[PDB]
Enzyme design. Sequence first.
Site, PDB file in Angstrom:
ATOM      1  CB  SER A 145      38.358   5.617 -27.861  1.00  0.00           C
ATOM      2  OG  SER A 145      37.223   5.309 -28.654  1.00  0.00           O
ATOM      3  CG  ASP A 243      32.664   3.032 -23.868  1.00  0.00           C
ATOM      4  OD1 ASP A 243      33.620   3.651 -23.356  1.00  0.00           O
ATOM      5  OD2 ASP A 243      32.376   3.101 -25.079  1.00  0.00           O
ATOM      6  CG  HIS A 287      33.932   7.061 -25.082  1.00  0.00           C
ATOM      7  ND1 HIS A 287      34.221   5.716 -25.169  1.00  0.00           N
ATOM      8  CD2 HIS A 287      34.441   7.628 -26.202  1.00  0.00           C
ATOM      9  CE1 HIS A 287      34.883   5.481 -26.288  1.00  0.00           C
ATOM     10  NE2 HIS A 287      35.028   6.624 -26.934  1.00  0.00           N
TER      11      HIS A 287
HETATM   12  C1  LIG Z   1      36.507  -3.400 -32.101  1.00  0.00           C
HETATM   13  O1  LIG Z   1      36.397  -2.049 -32.445  1.00  0.00           O
HETATM   14  C2  LIG Z   1      37.602  -1.343 -32.377  1.00  0.00           C
HETATM   15  C3  LIG Z   1      37.271   0.130 -32.155  1.00  0.00           C
HETATM   16  O2  LIG Z   1      38.131   0.884 -31.847  1.00  0.00           O
HETATM   17  N1  LIG Z   1      35.895   0.569 -32.325  1.00  0.00           N
HETATM   18  C4  LIG Z   1      35.448   1.941 -32.144  1.00  0.00           C
HETATM   19  N2  LIG Z   1      34.211   2.368 -32.323  1.00  0.00           N
HETATM   20  C5  LIG Z   1      33.965   3.649 -32.116  1.00  0.00           C
HETATM   21  C6  LIG Z   1      32.701   4.188 -32.280  1.00  0.00           C
HETATM   22  C7  LIG Z   1      31.836   3.655 -33.220  1.00  0.00           C
HETATM   23  C8  LIG Z   1      30.574   4.203 -33.382  1.00  0.00           C
HETATM   24  C9  LIG Z   1      30.184   5.281 -32.605  1.00  0.00           C
HETATM   25  C10 LIG Z   1      31.051   5.813 -31.666  1.00  0.00           C
HETATM   26  C11 LIG Z   1      32.311   5.266 -31.503  1.00  0.00           C
HETATM   27  C12 LIG Z   1      35.042   4.428 -31.731  1.00  0.00           C
HETATM   28  S1  LIG Z   1      36.366   3.327 -31.671  1.00  0.00           S
END
Ligand SMILES: COCC(=O)Nc1nc(-c2ccccc2)cs1
Length: 342
Positions: A145, A243, A287
């Site tokens: 993640s 995902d 996920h």
């Molecule tokens: C380019 O982005 C890098 C990154 O790591 N983004 C992430 N987003 C999440 C996330 C966001 C909202 C709801 C659940 C999970 C976890 S990690």
Amino acid sequence: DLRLHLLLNTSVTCNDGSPAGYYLKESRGSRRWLLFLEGGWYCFNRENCDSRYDTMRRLMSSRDWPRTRTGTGILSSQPEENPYWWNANMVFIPYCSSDVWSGASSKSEKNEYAFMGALIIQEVVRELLGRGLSGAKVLLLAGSSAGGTGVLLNVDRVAEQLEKLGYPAIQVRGLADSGWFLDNKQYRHAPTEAIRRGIRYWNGVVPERCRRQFQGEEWNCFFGYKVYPTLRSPVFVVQWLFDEAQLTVDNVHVQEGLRLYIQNLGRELRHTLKDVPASFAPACLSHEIIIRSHWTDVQVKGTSLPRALHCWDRSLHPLKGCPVHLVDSCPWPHCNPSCPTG
Ligand SMILES: COCC(=O)Nc1nc(-c2ccccc2)cs1
Ligand SMILES: *[C@@H]1O[C@H](CO)[C@@H](O)[C@H](O)[C@H]1NC(C)=O
């Protein structure tokens, strides 16, 4: 169990100034080293970082960290849980910088929090060389993640660090799990603005070739299909086609409009991976996977993920019945029967 070590250089800190660290289980008969980056979202301003400090403090501080940790999945030392690398040296690096492993800013009179993710890595590697990493043959930097995105942002810097330090024989590679996001249009009406604000808040750093391409536009390098083309180190990409974190940011929680949206998302992700020779992308709603205990269950075209990673190892010495590019073509969640029921 992997045992905790706090960083000897106490100026490399978690968000609240407490020392960063790593968990280590060492396998003196092996020259392979696995360094895994924990995930867990991020925060991008004072107000939502303050909220994170109240109810997610272990992701912002080491003051309450436990002393050992159980290796699971790819971090397990049992051959029947981990057919791939059960005999390797295992390292778990906790995520306590809230910056997608990109920051390089200390706590000061003008900064309430420290964002040092890129330097925490940078330094774990340094202290490990004195504990046997100096004799390694392969260093695999892995992550899930936010840690999977962190692999993409840092793998070439780790390679460069070991080259300047005088270790040209260590082969640095990357394994990015569930960190391959799309900056697509949401189903209902955003991620890209949160990343842009974060980089300024964090003093975030991105790989050099990608930075030179986009030149105010560094947020682009946080997205897999844009930064991967610029990397020299070999990187294996693991990504569920549907995902759950990607669907959450797209505001998806079934009639024709949503059916077309979900089918188009799978198609787009599938397209971005077609020139990625080492990849594993099943058509499932899930996920993360690589440190899950049952990570050996899912298969694509009859090949499991532990097998595909072994085939990758062989390719870096096409192979007969030992593939490395595995992407489902069927267009709906769980059209692969091996998908997790969870
Ligand atoms: C380019 O982005 C890098 C990154 O790591 N983004 C992430 N987003 C999440 C996330 C966001 C909202 C709801 C659940 C999970 C976890 S990690
Ligand atoms: C400790 O880390 C900081 C930040 O990365 C660096 O400026 C300093 O040189 C390091 N100290 C030592 C003794 O390596």
